[PDB]
Ligand SMILES: Nc1nc2c(c(=O)[nH]1)N[C@H](CN(C=O)c1ccc(C(=O)N[C@@H](CCC(=O)O)C(=O)O)cc1)CN2
């Protein structure tokens with residue numbers, strides 16, 4: 299009955315690409331609205347800007363308060379920066395793509411957390427929004443590897459790619475309201491808030507090589523920060539099977555050679 | 571040499587394993603024992619290795635006294651000393667570690683797997699090398715960490731499964747016909763004493779699974795119980811009933827708690 303069919307809220311390549319897909323296959327511009335994040339300056343950089351795409355393509359910029367009363371609107375959060383309260387909305391068609399393999403790693407900095415916690419894989423998860431943080435019923439999930447030398451930045455770019463793809467996979471059944479979901483289990487459910495991550499990580503070397511490597515690469519995301527060892531920024535960590543002795547630490551002009559308690563070789567590459 | 575085997579360590583695993591060799595394999599005269607430094611020589615919530623040895627006229631020795639015994643089987647069963655393999659003429663040096671190696675090398679392994687959200691643990695028979703819990707794996711038995719298991723419960727499973735894997739493998743060790751495999755670098759983790767604060771401060775900005783896990787990982791009454799508002803907790807019970815987000819209410823006998831995902835925990839106060 300309403301003119302507005304869908305709201306894309308959030309940021310970065312995922313939001314912009316998903317919005318382009320709907321504009322191309324599903325809805326005309328005047329049936330779409332967007333809510334960019336508060337820090338969206340409308341500048342294309344290492345990620346596309348949702349604000350800029352909307353401006354460039356004549357898609358109206360709204361607030362949450364403007365869409366609460368639109369019956370039957372489809373609302374999608376793609377890296378959106380606000381916690382919603384479902385009772386504000388007339389529509390119950392409220393969706394989020396969360397960058398983790400729920401029920402693990404709810405909350406923030408999910409490019410960092412699974413790496414820091416020694417995971418070999420991650421995922422993106424399409425779920426209904428309930429009042430809790432990343433707690434809603436799962437509609438679809440796609441898991442993928444965290445390669446051994448992947449950095450947080452590498453994992454983030456995989457989120458973007460696989461998140462975009464899971465949006466495309468599911469959007470038809472969302473629009474025709476034929477989707478199925480399953481409640482998240484209590485078991486395996488984990489969560490991190492911003493308070494739980496110090497982005498200036500102090501490395502604990504009394505750890506295995508795997509753990510030391512993980513501590514370094516979880517913080518490699520150059521647009522924000524790089525880990526520092528002996529007053530040198532690190533751009534890459536490489537973990538090998540080679541035994542070189544226990545608890546090695548040697549600084550060279552271009553790299554460190556490190557091993558932990560189990561003696562496997564790490565090369566930590568300096569930016570310089 | 572007359573002496574074929576040294577049992578070194580503590581607790582019912584060491585005592586029962588020694589009793590098994592005495593009964594099936596070797597005479598007292600063929601055995602020597604190194605108890606841990608804190609062995610009182612009386613039974614308590616575990617049996618004393620020192621007492622057992624003495625009761626059975628098995629000689630108490632030091633490490634210094636066994637280094638030069640050619641072909642001696644050295645068997646660490648919760649031993650409290652790090653060895654240096656070049657001290658020994660024999661290369662028949664073994665340990666049973668209370669984890670599913672290569673995860674959770676080092677200490678407090680009844681705590682660490684729970685605190686880190688694992689659903690299972692294991693015991694692992696390996697060759698001793700100069701690293702801590704790093705040597706080649708000969709056998710492993712994995713088993714569940716049940717949802718409401720405490721650190722104590724886990725520890726008693728370690729004792730039991732560890733005794734069993736000792737018995738399963740000891741003939742091949744004696745005959746030197748066992749097979750092993752080097753441990754992987756991936757999944758290897760380690761904890762040292764400094765990493766665990768045994769007076770745990772619960773982080774309630776977490777999921778109910780995580781809060782529960784935090785509690786029960788420190789339930790081991792012989793040492794400590796975790797404390798919530800000046801009451802010791804003896805049992806945590808996690809259910810999949812949703813009760814709302816971030817519940818915390820204290821009653822005379824228990825607390826009702828939920829985390830960010832709203833699943834019900836009952837934390838039972840110690841009766842004392
Ligand atoms: N109700 C609800 N809103 C949702 C989602 C959800 O699953 N449920 N998914 C997304 C969740 N999200 C992003 O994808 C998002 C946005 C902002 C904050 C937020 O305000 N975080 C602070 C909380 C401050 C505090 O509680 O102290 C933080 O971690 O410190 C959190 C998550 C978008 N909105």
Ligand SMILES: Nc1nc2c(c(=O)[nH]1)N[C@H](CN(C=O)c1ccc(C(=O)N[C@@H](CCC(=O)O)C(=O)O)cc1)CN2
Nearest residue numbers: 646649650651652653665699700701702703704762763
């Ligand atoms: N070389 C070696 N010795 C071994 C084993 C091993 O795999 N390798 N297994 C057992 C390992 N063990 C028990 O099963 C054991 C005994 C004491 C300490 C110890 O002294 N821990 C200190 C570490 C000091 C440090 O390395 O910095 C700690 O955590 O504070 C560690 C492990 C017995 N001895």
Ligand SMILES: Cc1cn([C@H]2C[C@H](O)[C@@H](COP(=O)(O)OP(=O)(O)O)O2)c(=O)[nH]c1=O
Nearest residue numbers: 405406407408409410450454497519522523
């Ligand atoms: C803000 C910030 C993000 N990051 C990384 C990790 C995050 O997974 C990724 C995307 O960040 P962001 O979009 O801010 O938050 P979230 O991961 O909480 O959705 O950027 C840093 O490494 N350092 C930072 O200071």
Ligand SMILES: Cc1cn([C@H]2C[C@H](O)[C@@H](COP(=O)(O)OP(=O)(O)O)O2)c(=O)[nH]c1=O
Nearest residue numbers: 676677678679680681721725768790793794
């Ligand atoms: C010493 C100590 C141990 N424990 C638990 C954790 C250990 O898994 C178990 C046996 O302790 P101990 O045998 O001293 O340590 P480890 O696990 O390092 O071999 O008891 C406590 O809960 N509190 C304590 O103070």
